[PDB]
Structures are given as C-alpha cells and as structure tokens.
Amino acid sequence: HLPQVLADAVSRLVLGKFGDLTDNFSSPHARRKVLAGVVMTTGTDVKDAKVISVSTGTKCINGEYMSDRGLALNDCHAEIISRRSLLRFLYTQLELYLNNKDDQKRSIFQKSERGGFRLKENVQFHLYISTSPCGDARIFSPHEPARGQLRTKIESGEGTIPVRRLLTMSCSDKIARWNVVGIQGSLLSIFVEPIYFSSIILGSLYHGDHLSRAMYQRISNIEDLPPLYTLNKPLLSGISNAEARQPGKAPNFSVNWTVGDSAIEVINATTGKDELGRASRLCKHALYCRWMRVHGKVPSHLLRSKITKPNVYHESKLAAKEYQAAKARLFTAFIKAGLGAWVEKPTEQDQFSLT
Amino acid sequence: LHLPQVLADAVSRLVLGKFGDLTDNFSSPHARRKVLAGVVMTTGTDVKDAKVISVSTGTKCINGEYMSDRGLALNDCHAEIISRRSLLRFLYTQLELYLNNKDDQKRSIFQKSERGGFRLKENVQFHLYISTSPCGDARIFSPHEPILEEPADRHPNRKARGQLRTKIESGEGTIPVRSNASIQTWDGVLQGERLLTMSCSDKIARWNVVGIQGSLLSIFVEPIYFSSIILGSLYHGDHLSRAMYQRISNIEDLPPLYTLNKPLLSGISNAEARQPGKAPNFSVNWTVGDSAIEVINATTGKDELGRASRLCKHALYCRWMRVHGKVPSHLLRSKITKPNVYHESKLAAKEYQAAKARLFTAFIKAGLGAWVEKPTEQDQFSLT
RNA sequence: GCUCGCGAUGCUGAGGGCUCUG
RNA sequence: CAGAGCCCCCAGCAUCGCGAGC
Numbered sequence: 114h115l116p117q118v119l120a121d122a123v124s125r126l127v128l129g130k131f132g133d134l135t136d137n138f139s140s141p142h143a144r145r146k147v148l149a150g151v152v153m154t155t156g157t158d159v160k161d162a163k164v165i166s167v168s169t170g171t172k173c174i175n176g177e178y179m180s181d182r183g184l185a186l187n188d189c190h191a192e193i194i195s196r197r198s199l200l201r202f203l204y205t206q207l208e209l210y211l212n213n214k215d216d217q218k219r220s221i222f223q224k225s226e227r228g229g230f231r232l233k234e235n236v237q238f239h240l241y242i243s244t245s246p247c248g249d250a251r252i253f254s255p256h257e258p259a260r261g262q263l264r265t266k267i268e269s270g271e272g273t274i275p276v277r278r279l280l281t282m283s284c285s286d287k288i289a290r291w292n293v294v295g296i297q298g299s300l301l302s303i304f305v306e307p308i309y310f311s312s313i314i315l316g317s318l319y320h321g322d323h324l325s326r327a328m329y330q331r332i333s334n335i336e337d338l339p340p341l342y343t344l345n346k347p348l349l350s351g352i353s354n355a356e357a358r359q360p361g362k363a364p365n366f367s368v369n370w371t372v373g374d375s376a377i378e379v380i381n382a383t384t385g386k387d388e389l390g391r392a393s394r395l396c397k398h399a400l401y402c403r404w405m406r407v408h409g410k411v412p413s414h415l416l417r418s419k420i421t422k423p424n425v426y427h428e429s430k431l432a433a434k435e436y437q438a439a440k441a442r443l444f445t446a447f448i449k450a451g452l453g454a455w456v457e458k459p460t461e462q463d464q465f466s467l468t
Numbered sequence: 469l470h471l472p473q474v475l476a477d478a479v480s481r482l483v484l485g486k487f488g489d490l491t492d493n494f495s496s497p498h499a500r501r502k503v504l505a506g507v508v509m510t511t512g513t514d515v516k517d518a519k520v521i522s523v524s525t526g527t528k529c530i531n532g533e534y535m536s537d538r539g540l541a542l543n544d545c546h547a548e549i550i551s552r553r554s555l556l557r558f559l560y561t562q563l564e565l566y567l568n569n570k571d572d573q574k575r576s577i578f579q580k581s582e583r584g585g586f587r588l589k590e591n592v593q594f595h596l597y598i599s600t601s602p603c604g605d606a607r608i609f610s611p612h613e614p615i616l617e618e619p620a621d622r623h624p625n626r627k628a629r630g631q632l633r634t635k636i637e638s639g640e641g642t643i644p645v646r647s648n649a650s651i652q653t654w655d656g657v658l659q660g661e662r663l664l665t666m667s668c669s670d671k672i673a674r675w676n677v678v679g680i681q682g683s684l685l686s687i688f689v690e691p692i693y694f695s696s697i698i699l700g701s702l703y704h705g706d707h708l709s710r711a712m713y714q715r716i717s718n719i720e721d722l723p724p725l726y727t728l729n730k731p732l733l734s735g736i737s738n739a740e741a742r743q744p745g746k747a748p749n750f751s752v753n754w755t756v757g758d759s760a761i762e763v764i765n766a767t768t769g770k771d772e773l774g775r776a777s778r779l780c781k782h783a784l785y786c787r788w789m790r791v792h793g794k795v796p797s798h799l800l801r802s803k804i805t806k807p808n809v810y811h812e813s814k815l816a817a818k819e820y821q822a823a824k825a826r827l828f829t830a831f832i833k834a835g836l837g838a839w840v841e842k843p844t845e846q847d848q849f850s851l852t
Numbered sequence: 853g854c855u856c857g858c859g860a861u862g863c864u865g866a867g868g869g870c871u872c873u874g
Numbered sequence: 875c876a877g878a879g880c881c882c883c884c885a886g887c888a889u890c891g892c893g894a895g896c
C-alpha cells in the first residue's frame with residue numbers, strides 16, 4: 114500500500130546501492146545522466162526489499178560495431194541494462210532451486226501446477242528510472258498542463274524519432290512490450306511463467322497521462338494473448354524530491370551490477386563491450402551460457418516448452434511458442450492502433466552457437 | 469536616404485528614439501538592455517517617410533525544459549530575431565487592412581500583384597538595425613569595435629570562415645555544425661542534450677534568400693527582403709558581407725521572385741557604447757500600433773506570469789488563420805491544401821520550401837555545414 | 853596560403869558561493 | 875520568491891611561437 118512511500122523507498126534504495134558501488138559517488142564511473150534499477154519485495158512488509166540490479170547509460174552501439182556472435186550490447190540505456198541484470202538474477206534463482214533440495218526454500222521460484230517454475234506468492238519486481246524513458250513517455254512540455262507512435266533511438270544522439278534495419282526501439286516501447294510478453298524474455302519463458310513489473314517509479318519528468326499511454330493504454334486494443342499473458346498495468350509514480358535537468362555532454366559508458374556481483378561492470382555504449390574490448394556478462398552470448406547451464410539441469414518433462422539439443426540462439430528463442438505468439442499479438446495491437454510497425458533486427462545477428 | 473551613411477545614421481537614431489519613448493526616456497527598469505534591434509520602413513526618398521515598425525532587446529534563447537509542444541514559447545530572444553517576428557505582426561495587420569474595405573486599400577503597404585496574391589507598393593523598403601554584429605559568422609572572428617590600425621581579416625581562406633554556427637544552451641561560443649552528430653530530438657533535449665539554435669548570422673543569410681515574411685505569409689504575399697542591415701557597433705565589412713550573402717553566392721535554381729538579396733551593409737558615424745552591467749534575462753518587443761512593450765523571460769519564452777507572447781508561433785498561426793478566412797481562394801499565391809496543423813500549413817508554401825531547400829544545399833556544397841532544425845514535434849500543434 | 857598536432861597569451865551562454873537590495 | 879555587485883567554476887575563436895603534411 115501507500116504508492117508514494119514505495120516509490121520513495123525504491124528510489125532511495127537504488128540510489129543508496131549506486132553510492133556503495135562507486136566509493137560514495139566519488140569514483141569516475143558515478144558520472145551518469147540516467148540511473149536505473151530493480152528492487153524486489155517479498156510480502157506486504159516495509160523494508161524486506163532487495164536491490165536486484167543497478168545500471169546507468171543513455172547511448173546505443175554504432176552499426177560498425179554490431180556482433181553477429183552475441184558479444185556486443187545493442188542498447189545501453191539504463192532501464193534496458195537493468196532488465197538484463199534482472200535476467201542474471203533470475204538464472205541464479207533457478208540454479209538456487211535446482212542445485213540442492215535444502216536451497217529450494219531460499220529461491221523465489223517454486224514448481225507450477227501448469228509445468229516448469231513460477232514466482233512464490235508476493236515476490237514482486239519494481240523498476241526505478243531517474244527520468245521518464247525515451248520515446249512516447251517523454252513527448253510533452255513539463256511546464257504546461259496523434260500520440261503513441263512507436264519511436265527508434267537515433268544513431269548518434271540520446272533521443273528518438275517516430276517510425277513510418279540498424280535501428281533500436283525506444284525504452285517507452287520496450288517497457289510497453291514488457292507489460293505484455295513479461296520482463297523475462299523468450300529463453301527464460303521456456304523454464305518460467307511470465308513475470309511483470311508491479312511498479313515503474315520515475316525520478317523526473319513524471320507525468321501520469323503520458324506515462325500510462327506509453328506503458329500500456331495505447332495498446333489496450335490487444336486481442337487474444339495465450340494463457341498467463343496479460344496487459345500488465347503496473348503502479349506508476351514519481352518521487353517526492355524530483356531530479357533537475359543537467360544540460361551538458363552525456364558520458365560514453367554504461368554501468369551494470371546484479372545482487373551477488375562484487376563490483377560494477379563498465380561498458381562503452383558505442384562498442385557494446387567493456388573498456389578492454391571484452392564481452393559484457395549481459396551480452397546475448399553470456400545469457401545464452403547461463404540459459405544452457407540451466408537447460409542441462411532441468412529434465413525434459415519439466416520444461417514449459419519442448420527443446421532438445423539446443424544449438425543456435427535463434428532456434429532456441431523460436432521454441433518459446435507462447436512468448437512468440439504474445440509478441441505477434443503485441444506487434445498487431447500497435448499496427449491496428451495506427452502506431453507503427455516494430456523494427457526487428459535482421460535474425461543473422463541471433464544466428465550463433467556456443468560452439 | 470539616398471546617401472548610404474545618412475540612411476544608416478537615421479535608421480539608428482529612429483530605433484534608439486522609439487525605444488526611448490517606450491521606456492519613459494530610458495528611465496524604466498525594462499530599458500535595461502545589452503543588445504537593441506529594430507525595423508524601419510521607408511516609403512520613399514525623404515526622412516519624413518521613415519517609420520519605425522518594430523523594436524526589440526535580448527541576448528538569450530530558451531532553456532530545453534521550457535520548449536512548448538503547443539507553440540506558446542519564444543525559442544530565440546536575440547534582439548534581431550525578435551524584431552523580425554514583430555515585423556510579421558505588422559505584415560498581418562497590413563494584409564487585414566487592405567481586405568477591410570476599398571478606402572483602406574490606399575493606406576495598406578500591399579497591392580494585388582500581376583502574378584496572384586499581394587506584393588508591396590513600389591518604393592516600400594525595410595531596414596534592419598542591430599546595436600551590435602549578429603552572432604556567428606559576422607561576429608565570432610572579431611567581436612570588438614574596429615580599429616583603423618587593424619587591417620581587415622588576415623586569414624579569409626580558413627575552413628572556419630563562412631561556417632554555419634549554433635548558439636548552444638549553457639555554452640558560450642557559437643559552435644560549427646558537425647557531420648558525426650545529427651538531428652535534435654524532443655526527448656533528447658528534455659533529459660539534457662543542449663538545445664542548438666542557428667546563429668543570427670545564419671538566420672539573416674536565410675532571410676536574404678527566402679525573404680523575411682516566413683513560410684505562412686508567403687501563401688498570401690511575394691517574398692520581402694531587407695534593403696539594408698545597419699550595425700550600431702562592431703561593424704566589420706568583410707565578415708558581414710561574407711555572413712549575409714557572399715558565402716552562398718553558389719546558390720542556384722531558386723523559385724521565381726526568390727533571389728540572393730545583397731542589402732546595403734553599414735555601420736554608423738558614432739558607434740553605440742558597450743551597455744554596462746550583467747545581460748538581463750528578459751527580451752522586449754514592440755510593433756507599430758501597440759500601446760506598450762511586452763516583456764518576455766527569454767529563459768522560459770513566456771512573460772513573468774507564464775502567459776504566451778503576441779510573438780509565439782501559436783499567436784502567429786492565430787493571425788494567419790484569421791487572414792486565411794478573409795482571403796478568397798483566387799487571391800491565394802498557393803492552392804496547396806494542408807491540415808490545420810502548424811507544421812502542415814507551412815508545407816502549403818511549396819515555393820518557400822523549395823527556396824529553403826536550395827539555401828540548405830548551397831551551405832552544404834560550399835562546405836559550410838547542414839542547417840540544424842528544432843525537433844519535428846515542436847510544430848505538431850493546432851489552434852486550441 | 854590551407855590542414856593537423858603541441859605550447860603560450862587572450863576573446864566570447866550556463867552552474868555555484870559571498871555580500872547588499874526589493 | 876526576485877534582482878544586482880563581487881568572487882569561483884564550467885567549445886568554439888584570435889594572436890604569436892614550435893613541429894609536420896599539402
């Protein structure tokens with residue numbers, strides 16, 4: 114209960130954890146334009162909240178530097194990187210369940226009636242972003258009392274343009290996408306049921322009408338979702354002491370951290386790789402490694418989708434047929450509302466193996 | 469009035485004088501300025517025939533946060549920019565005047581044109597005053613009073629010469645356009661990308677091609693040009709001639725009536741003095757017929773109380789719609805139909821849009837950069 | 853004459869603090 | 875709430891020198 118107290122706690126917890134990871138904000142990698150994070154709650158408590166993930170970044174990869182081997186991060190906007198960090202947590206929580214019977218009590222996952230795994234009662238995830246996400250949620254005049262267009266991130270800069278190959282969808286559109294197909298992605302949907310954010314908390318440029326349109330209301334025309342998939346309508350809130358616009362140059366790097374990690378990981382938004390040119394623990398390849406390790410531990414009869422001898426990344430995603438159908442329904446709802454066609458990257462980029 | 473320097477001195481004197489009348493002989497708190505500008509209309513040979521159309525002050529552009537998706541905010545409060553917008557109100561009033569009755573046709577500056585719609589009566593000219601050199605190419609390389617002992621520009625073949633330049637939010641310095649960076653966005657500017665505004669040197673060059681009336685008025689009237697640009701200080705003839713026209717002498721394939729205008733360029737006999745103190749945050753505007761100046765917070769693009777200027781895009785669109793309803797179809801210079809959306813209505817000025825296109829290509833072909841526009845969302849509004 | 857890098861001295865819209873004032 | 879005076883601080887130009895390329 115009390116939306117504004119939750120909002121404040123989530124905002125305070127994520128900022129607090131960012132401090133600890135940056136020598137109380139004094140490290141050069143505390144330099145950020147947008148801060149994001151995910152907080153998990155367990156029961157209608159107060160302070161039984163855990164920061165799951167902490168991220169920064171405002172920039173995307175140049176085309177020259179795109180990987181056809183899953184070694185490069187395509188999108189380093191804080192909120193996108195915070196989701197990917199949550200995927201690392203969810204793989205860890207599946208290994209916790211699977212590695213020892215006595216650890217099943219400590220995992221957020223339990224066996225589901227319907228097959229594979231689902232969350233335990235009252236396990237919720239909350240998204241913090243220090244500003245409203247790029248795209249439709251940020252197309253207004255904050256000093257003033259055709260909308261819902263899908264938008265793409267512009268090659269160089271930090272903002273978006275409407276649509277009608279090398280192009281990334283806005284954060285406003287990706288969170289709307291997460292409010293249909295879940296936050297967990299295609300590959301995790303093979304082990305676990307759809308997972309939604311209960312709350313989206315903004316640290317600035319909060320606006321109830323614009324954010325609700327961006328996040329779900331523009332696609333309430335959505336049709337015939339498979340079972341467990343809903344149009345999720347999370348709690349939307351700003352925070353009590355909002356953050357001021359700081360006009361200037363925006364940093365070139367993106368920070369990420371997941372609960373359990375000893376240190377932040379610093380990526381170059383331009384290359385999608387860390388400062389020494391190695392692959393992130395968040396890239397397609399690294400998440401596919403986590404997924405493959407869990408696929409090795411889960412008996413065939415316990416999968417929510419059939420998939421034996423997984424090799425190519427793209428094939429393994431196509432096996433999540435509930436998810437691919439809810440994605441189709443999503444792509445249709447935007448078209449029929451007159452809001453544009455989702456830009457998908459050419460699926461040679463996902464044609465790689467762990468060979 | 470026929471001698472370049474007398475006209476130049478009269479234009480300066482009239483704008484100073486009018487600004488004085490409006491600020492209780494410079495006593496009032498809104499007399500405080502760093503840069504003054506104005507438009508004077510001559511309707512013939514004698515000083516009697518000189519009328520001040522507009523007066524403005526200001527040195528500042530809007531803060532990114534305060535951009536209005538309804539066109540209720542002034543984006544650029546550089547004096548010379550505000551003085552042109554004040555002229556636009558005069559031109560709308562003068563069109564409504566012609567249309568009012570047959571008596572009034574005689575007292576309008578406009579007559580029906582042989583080629584459709586309206587044009588100026590013979591010998592109606594406009595003259596722009598700025599108390600200093602316009603920011604960008606006319607100013608950046610020598611923003612100080614000229615000195616006899618200083619021998620003009622020693623390095624006129626430098627790449628930096630003639631370049632399109634932007635004012636940059638929170639940054640001093642008028643900065644070239646670069647090819648690596650691209651398109652400004654609404655969402656980018658709100659979260660803190662610095663808002664870029666094209667320099668006044670670049671905007672007056674534009675006016676010497678597409679005219680001063682803008683896209684909307686071009687649907688009713690033929691292109692209007694400044695006959696003179698007069699600087700009350702920091703006059704440097706070689707930088708100003710380059711900035712105002714000579715750098716895009718390469719421009720081609722202009723629509724009919726559009727041309728590369730080469731206005732008289734001049735300083736004055738007794739240069740204006742450096743205005744003392746900190747640059748005020750407000751911009752003043754006045755058009756002939758107004759009872760008083762309007763004061764705008766240039767940081768917000770609105771007045772002290774948050775109300776829109778008589779000069780904001782919404783007020784100009786409102787003026788255009790009112791005239792649009794009194795001009796019969798057969799007097800339109802353009803028959804192209806567009807939705808009553810600010811952006812869309814400007815696209816009915818097909819010839820103006822083609823002249824803008826030629827302008828942009830000429831800056832690019834000359835190696836002087838690509839023009840930087842506001843985010844496309846700015847002008848996506850309607851009346852109410 | 854231009855371009856690039858280095859050095860030097862200068863030039864030209866923000867943020868912060870102190871003081872006074874309305 | 876606003877304004878001013880003073881200090882502090884934050885991407886282009888000028889001038890001169892050094893090196894190189896054209």
Ligand SMILES: O=P(O)(O)O[C@H]1[C@H](OP(=O)(O)O)[C@H](OP(=O)(O)O)[C@H](OP(=O)(O)O)[C@@H](OP(=O)(O)O)[C@H]1OP(=O)(O)O
Pocket residue numbers: 187188193196197281282287297298299300396397430456457458463
């Ligand atoms: O975190 P993101 O940057 O938003 O990454 C997503 C994510 O890809 P990965 O999990 O492999 O990195 C989507 O994967 P799933 O929803 O299938 O789990 C995928 O979408 P599809 O593979 O379903 O097509 C793709 O998006 P897209 O192909 O639509 O461009 C991509 O987004 P980016 O390409 O923008 O990184």
Ligand SMILES: O=P(O)(O)O[C@H]1[C@H](OP(=O)(O)O)[C@H](OP(=O)(O)O)[C@H](OP(=O)(O)O)[C@@H](OP(=O)(O)O)[C@H]1OP(=O)(O)O
Pocket residue numbers: 543544549552553665666671681682683684781784814840841842847
């Ligand atoms: O130079 P300003 O007086 O500030 O105004 C101009 C003017 O816009 P408005 O009359 O609506 O304010 C131009 O419009 P036109 O009259 O030439 O049609 C427009 O250019 P576009 O029409 O191409 O939209 C735009 O310039 P831009 O979009 O290049 O930024 C803008 O300049 P500002 O944005 O700086 O105010």
Ligand SMILES: [Zn+2]
Pocket residue numbers: 190246247248283284285
């Ligand atoms: Zn984003």
Ligand SMILES: [Zn+2]
Pocket residue numbers: 546602603667668669
């Ligand atoms: Zn200017």
